[model samples]
Target: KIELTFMFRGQPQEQTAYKNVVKKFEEKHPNVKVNIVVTSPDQYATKLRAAIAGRKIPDVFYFNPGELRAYVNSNVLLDITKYVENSKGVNLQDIWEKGVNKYRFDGEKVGQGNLYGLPKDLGPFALGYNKTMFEKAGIPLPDKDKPYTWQEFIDVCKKLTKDTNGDGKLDQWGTGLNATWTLQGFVWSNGADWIDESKTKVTVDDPKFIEALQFFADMQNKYKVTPSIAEAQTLDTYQRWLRGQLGFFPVGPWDLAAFDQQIKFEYDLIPWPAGSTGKPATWVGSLGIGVSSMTKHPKEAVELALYLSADPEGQKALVDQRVQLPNSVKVAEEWAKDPSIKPANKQEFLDIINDYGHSFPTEYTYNGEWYDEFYRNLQPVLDGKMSAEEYVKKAKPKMQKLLDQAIEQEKQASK
Candidate 1:
C-alpha cells in the first residue's frame, strides 16, 4: 500500500471529472491512497517546476510535451512501457495516436520513445464563426469542406466589420486573434515552420513565414479586420469577442463548457481560412499525466494515468460535461456524428487532427524561448511601423542563439 500524490490544473468541471475518476480508482484499488492537489492554471507550471527543482515531485502530474526532453534527461519521468502495454483495457490502438505520441521520447526526438505519460486530453484548435453575424448580413454560412483563401476571407471580414451601434467609431470587428496563439494556423498553411527538420535551426526568415506574419499583422494594420492598437488596449480582443463584436475566433474543445455558459449568439466551427497551400492548417495540443520515476508505486501511478486517460466511464463523464472530446477514437467518432451539439461541426476538430493538425513547433526543440522570441518582438510589425521582411531578418539570429543554448543544455543534462 502506498500514498500517491497527483498535481494538475483544470476547470471546475474538469476537476470534478478527475475527482470522480479518482474515487472510482480508489474504491477498486483500496491499497493505494491517492492525494489530489490542485492549482490555478496560471500558477501550475511554475509551481510544478519548483516542486521538480526541489526534488519533491508528485507521484503523478501534468507535463508538457515540450518539457519531455528536459524531464527525461533529468531522469524525472517513469518508463511506463510495460505497465501501459499490460494494463487491462488500455489498448493503445483505441486512443488518439497523436495524443499518445506526444509523450513518447526515445532519447533524441519526442515521437518515437518509451511512453512517459498519458494524455489528459488532445485539443484540436478549431476556427469558430459567429453564425448570427453571417446570417444577419445575408452571407452564406462557411462551407465546412471549403476554406476561404486569404483574399476571400478579407472580403468576408470587410462585410462583417461595421458600426453596429450607428456611432462614428466601428463597434463590431470581423476577427480578433492573438498572434502567439493563432498565427500557427496561418504560417503552417503557408508551409513555413519555426524550425528546420533538424529542430535546431530558427527558420522564421523564410518568405512564406514572413508573408503569414505580415498577413496576421495586416488584419489589424492593413486589412482592418481586427482592432486597432489603441482600441485593443482599451477593450482588448478577447473581451471584444466575448461581447459578440468579433465574427471569427479560435475555439478549442476545452472552451465548450465556458462557451455554453457565456456565449449568447449562434456560433459554429469552420475550417481556418487557408494560405498559399489552399488547405486549412491548425495545431493540436495535449497535457500529459506523467508518473515520476521517483514514485515508489510505479504500477499504481501508471494505472491512475491509464484510467484517467482511457477508461470508459471517466471519458464519458468529461465528454458529457463538454470539457473535452473523448480520448477514445471510437467514442470521438460517434460523438462527432451528432448534429444537435452546439457549434454542430465537431468533425472539423477530428479532421484537423487526422489529416492536417500539427504539434506546437517547440515540441521538437529542447526549449521554447526561441519560439517565444518570434512573437515577443513583433510589436513594430503589428503596429504597421515595420515590414515583415525586416522583422524576420532581425528575429532569426536572436532566436537561433537561444535555441542553441537550449540544445547545449539538453546535451549537458544527458551527460
Candidate 2:
C-alpha cells in the first residue's frame, strides 16, 4: 500500500468529517494509506511552514490560494495543468466558464499553460445579519436579490447599532468588520487591485485604489457604524459574532456552522455591498489539493486527484455542515439541492458565485507577507491615525520593492 499524508486545520466537526472522508478513500483504494495530521487553525500555518522547511511535507494537504505563491516559489508544488489536460482533454470551456475565468485560469486562456492545483472549495464574503435584531429594531429584512450599496449598507448598520440597555455603553454593535481580506473586497469593487496586472509592480497609489482605501478606512472612523479598530483588536471578530453583539460582518459560507442552534436570533447571508463600479464583488478563498514535486508517483497522484473528484461520495465525505462550498460545478449544484440549506438563500448564493465573486490572487508573486503589510498599514489608516494618501504613499514603495524581488525570483526560476 502506498502511504499518503493529509494535513488539515479544522475544528472538531471538521476533523471528524475529514477523517470519515479519508477513511472512505482508503477503503476505496486499499493499496493507498492516507495518514491524517490535524492541526489547530492558529498553528496550522506555522506548523506547515516548519514542516516544509524540515522536509516533512505531506503528500496531499489542504491549502489556500493565498498561499499558492509561497508553495510555487519554493518549488514544492507540482504543476497540475498537465494532469488536468490529460484527464479532461483540455476542454476548459465546458465547466464553470465564469468560475474558470474568475478563478481557474492559471495564467491565460487558450493554450497558455499554468495549473497549480484543483480547489476543494470557493468562498465568498457576505453579510451575516441577525434577524432578531432587525425584528426588534423594526428594520425590514435585507433584499437578498438586490443588496445595498456601501453608503446605504452603513446607514442600515447605524440604525441597528444602539444602546439597547441604556447602560451608557453600546450593548450591540451595528456591525463589526474583519478588515483583513475584506479590505481587498472593497478595492476590487472599486476596480482597483493591490498590484499591477503583471503582478510585477505595485500601483496602489491609483486614484480608484486610493478611493477604495479611503472609503474602507472611513467605514470605521468617519461613518462610525462599525467597531473601532482598537475595539476589534481587543474583542476579536469571531468571538464578537458568537456573543451576538455584532450585527453584520463580511464573512464566508464557513460561518454558517458557527451559529448556536439555540441562539435567539435569525440570520441570513447577503451579497456584498456595491461600490461605484456598478458591480458588486467578494474576495474568494479556497482550499485545494496539490501534488508534491518530490513525489515519485506523479501519474498516480494525478489519478488520485481525478478519482477524488469523480464521485459525489468523495465530496460528501470531505465537507462538513456548511464549512465549504464545493469546487466542482456538479458538486455545487448538488450542494444547492440540499433541503437543510435555506431555500431562500439558495439562489442568492449561486448568483453571487456566478456574477459578483472573484478568486483571491494565486500568482506566485503574491507572497503571504502582503497580508501582513495590508493589515499593519490598514488599521492605522482606518483609525484616522494616518491619512489614506499618506499611508498609500508609504506603502506603495515597499510594495514595489517586494514586487521587484518576486520578479527577480521568477526570472531565477526560468534559469
Candidate 3:
C-alpha cells in the first residue's frame, strides 16, 4: 500500500472530519494508506517551514492561500500541470476562473500548471448584522434593495452603541472590530492596497488608503462606535459578536454552521459598504490542499487533492462536516439551494463572490509583515493616540524600506 501523511492546522474536530474523508477515499483506493498530522494554528507556519527545511515532507497538506506563493516559488510543491488537464468532476472551463487566477505564479497556475494547491474550501468576508440589536435601537432593518455606504454604516454603528443604564458608559458595543484581515477590503475598495499590486512599492500612504484608514480609525475615536484596541485587552471580538453586544461584525460563510445556533438574536449577512471612491470590493479568503514536492507519489497525492476539491460527493462530505463553502461551483449551487441550509441573506454573499470579491495579490513577499504593521499602527490612530497625518507619515518610511527589499529580493531570485 502507498503511505500518505496529511498535515493540517486545526482542532481535533476538523482533523477528524478530514480524516474520515480520507478513510472513505482510501476505501475506494484500497492500496493507499493515510496518516493525519494535526498542528496547532499558532505554530503552523513555523512547523510547516521546519518540516520543509528538514526534508520531512508530508505527501498531502492543507494551508491558506496567503502562504502558498512562497511555497510555489521555493519549488517545494509538486507542479501538477498534467494532473488537472485530465481531472474530472470540476469543469475547468466553468470553474470560477477568477478563483484560481490568484494562485497562479507568473505564467503557471498553482497546482494545475506549476500551481501548488487545489482549493478545498472558500470563505469570503461579509457583513454579519444582528437583527435584535438593530430593532432595540429603533433602526430599520438593512434595506435589501440598497447596500449601505461606509459613512452610513458608521452612522448605524453609532446609533447601535448604547448606554442602556444611562451611566455615561456604553453597555453594548455596536460592532466587532477584532478582524484585522477584513481591514484590507477598505483599502482595496478604494483602489488602493497595503502594498502595490506589483509588490514593488508600498502604497500604504496613498491618499485613498490614508483616507480609508482614517475613517476606519474614527469608528472608535470620532463615532465612539467600536471598542478601542487598548481597552479591548481581554475581549474576544467573536465572542462579543455572538453575545449580541455587537450589532454588526465581519465574518465569512465558514462560521455559518457553528454560528447558526450561537446567537440568541436573529442575524444575517450584508455586503460591506462602498468606499468614498464608490467601489465596494470584498475580501475573499480560501484554504486548500497541496502536494509536497518530496512526496514519493506525487501522482496519487495530486489525484486525491483533485478529488476532494472537485468531486460532488466529496464536497457533500465537506458540507456534512460543517465545513465552509466549497470552491466548486457545482457544489455551491447544490448547497446554496438546500432548504435546510438557507442563509438569511443568501444573495449578499453570492453577489460579493460574483461581483466585488478580491484576494490579496500574490506578488507581495512580506505580506504578513505589511498587514501586521498596518494593523498595529492603525490602532493608535483609532484610539486617538495619533492623528491620521502623523500615522501616515510615520508608517510610510518603514513601508518604503520593506518595499525596496521585497523588490530587490524578487529581482535577484528571478535572475
Candidate 2 positional error at 288, Å = 2.1
lDDT of 1: 0.88
Residue-level lDDT tens digits of model 2 in 1-415: 6877767787665676667777777787788877778987777888878878987777766666555655666776788777778764434443344333322434323123476655555666666677778888899888776768888888888898788888987667777676665777678888887777876667678888888889877777888776667778788766776667777765466655555332356677777777778677876555666677677667666555554433455655545455656656766777677767653465456666777776654333545465356556666787788988888888877767766766665566544
Q: How close is candidate 1 to the true structure, as a TM-score?
A: 0.93
Error of 1 at 173 (Å): 1.0
What is candidate 1's lDDT per residue for 31-86, written digit by digit as tens? 98899998877789889989999989999999888998889988889899999999
The TM-score-based order of candidates, best leading, equals: 1, 3, 2
- Please give the distance, in angstroms, between residue 254's alpha carbon in candidate 3 and its true position after superposition: 1.4
Given candidate 2, what's the lDDT at residue 323? 61
Q: Name the regions of candidate 1 deviating beyond 4 angstroms.
A: 11-13, 16-33
For model 1, give the RMSD to the true fold. 2.0
Error of 2 at 190 (Å): 2.3
Model 2 scores worst on lDDT over the 10 consecutive residues at 102-111
A best-first ranking of the candidates according to their lDDT comes to: 1, 3, 2
**Largest TM-score belongs to which candidate?**
1
Backbone clashes in model 3, listed as residue pairs: 109-115, 110-115, 110-116, 111-115, 111-116
TM-score of every prediction relative to native: 0.93, 0.84, 0.88
